[PDB]
Design a protein around this nucleic acid. Sequence first.
DNA 1: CCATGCGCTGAC
DNA 2: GTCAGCGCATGG
Length: 327
Amino acid sequence: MIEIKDKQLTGLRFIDLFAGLGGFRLALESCGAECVYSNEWDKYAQEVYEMNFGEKPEGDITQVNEKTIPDHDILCAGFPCQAFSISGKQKGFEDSRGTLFFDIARIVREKKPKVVFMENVKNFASHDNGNTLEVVKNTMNELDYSFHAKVLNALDYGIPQKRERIYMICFRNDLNIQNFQFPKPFELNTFVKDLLLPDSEVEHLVIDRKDLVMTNQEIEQTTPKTVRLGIVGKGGQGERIYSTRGIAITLSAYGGGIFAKTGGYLVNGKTRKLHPRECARVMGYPDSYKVHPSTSQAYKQFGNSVVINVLQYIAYNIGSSLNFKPY
DNA sequence: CCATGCGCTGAC
DNA sequence: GTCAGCGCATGG
Ligand SMILES: Nc1ncnc2c1ncn2[C@@H]1O[C@H](CSCC[C@H](N)C(=O)O)[C@@H](O)[C@H]1O
């Protein structure tokens, strides 16, 4: 993450829904805001959140009375993507997991915060020929909010990971905000090779497979693109090997293969997967965030999370526009 | 719970 | 053609 000097959101309040690791919370506090409610139902994620933050989130959002929820200015939410991802079966609103959106709509109708901040995957902008996206725009409008949505790639905001996601910012109409803008892109100056741990700490992750088929040569100079070097097996998800002189592929939560969830990389002569701490870094997490003791649960957790740095750039802009009140 | 082999979709 | 994906489905 990046350090913010102008704490533009001092004094405002927010809630962390579908918390996971608390990425939306690290980002929003670096700007001065206060968290007054969190919700997340997974046992293991509740263990890490409490360990880093010291409070335990409520559970199941579907059986919580929206009238118990504390007053708040900003509502934050990265909802489940499985029923929208380009990796699954694409069932959408018909899926038991693809309806969580209407629970946010319930909370919003009763509490009416100043701002609504949501995140989801790339395919969500196109799914169902764009109808799925239009159901969200039209609902937020009916509730009396404006609607801003864009796809941003992390490699354009300083982190070397090819992660494309859709971000949705919404403002209540009596505030008359007319100058919100998405942050502007810049050049990448950090590559995968600059974030790895010493060879003595990742030796147990080294993999010597005999069906290794190198299909490209190691590159000489750094490039802000994923450069594939080889394959194992048939070369499906989890069997592709990449160069450390470029950028990392998207981490996932339920992925498989011999190099499950992180991808394989050619490091100092041998192919291996990424360590949890290295996963933290490619997502923008500080070295002081304490990871879960179960390696398995940690990989899953970083797979479902958001890149802190990108959230930090967006939150400053939300603040700049809210603080512009001339005579 | 944990690991690993898929086999299809989308955006060029 | 070419390549990448906050995943699915079965085994102990
Ligand atoms: N019904 C529900 N009630 C509470 N939490 C739920 C839920 N349904 C799904 N979740 C949680 O929804 C989360 C979505 S991904 C959240 C990641 C978060 N943005 C980050 O910074 O970590 C998952 O962790 C899942 O465990």
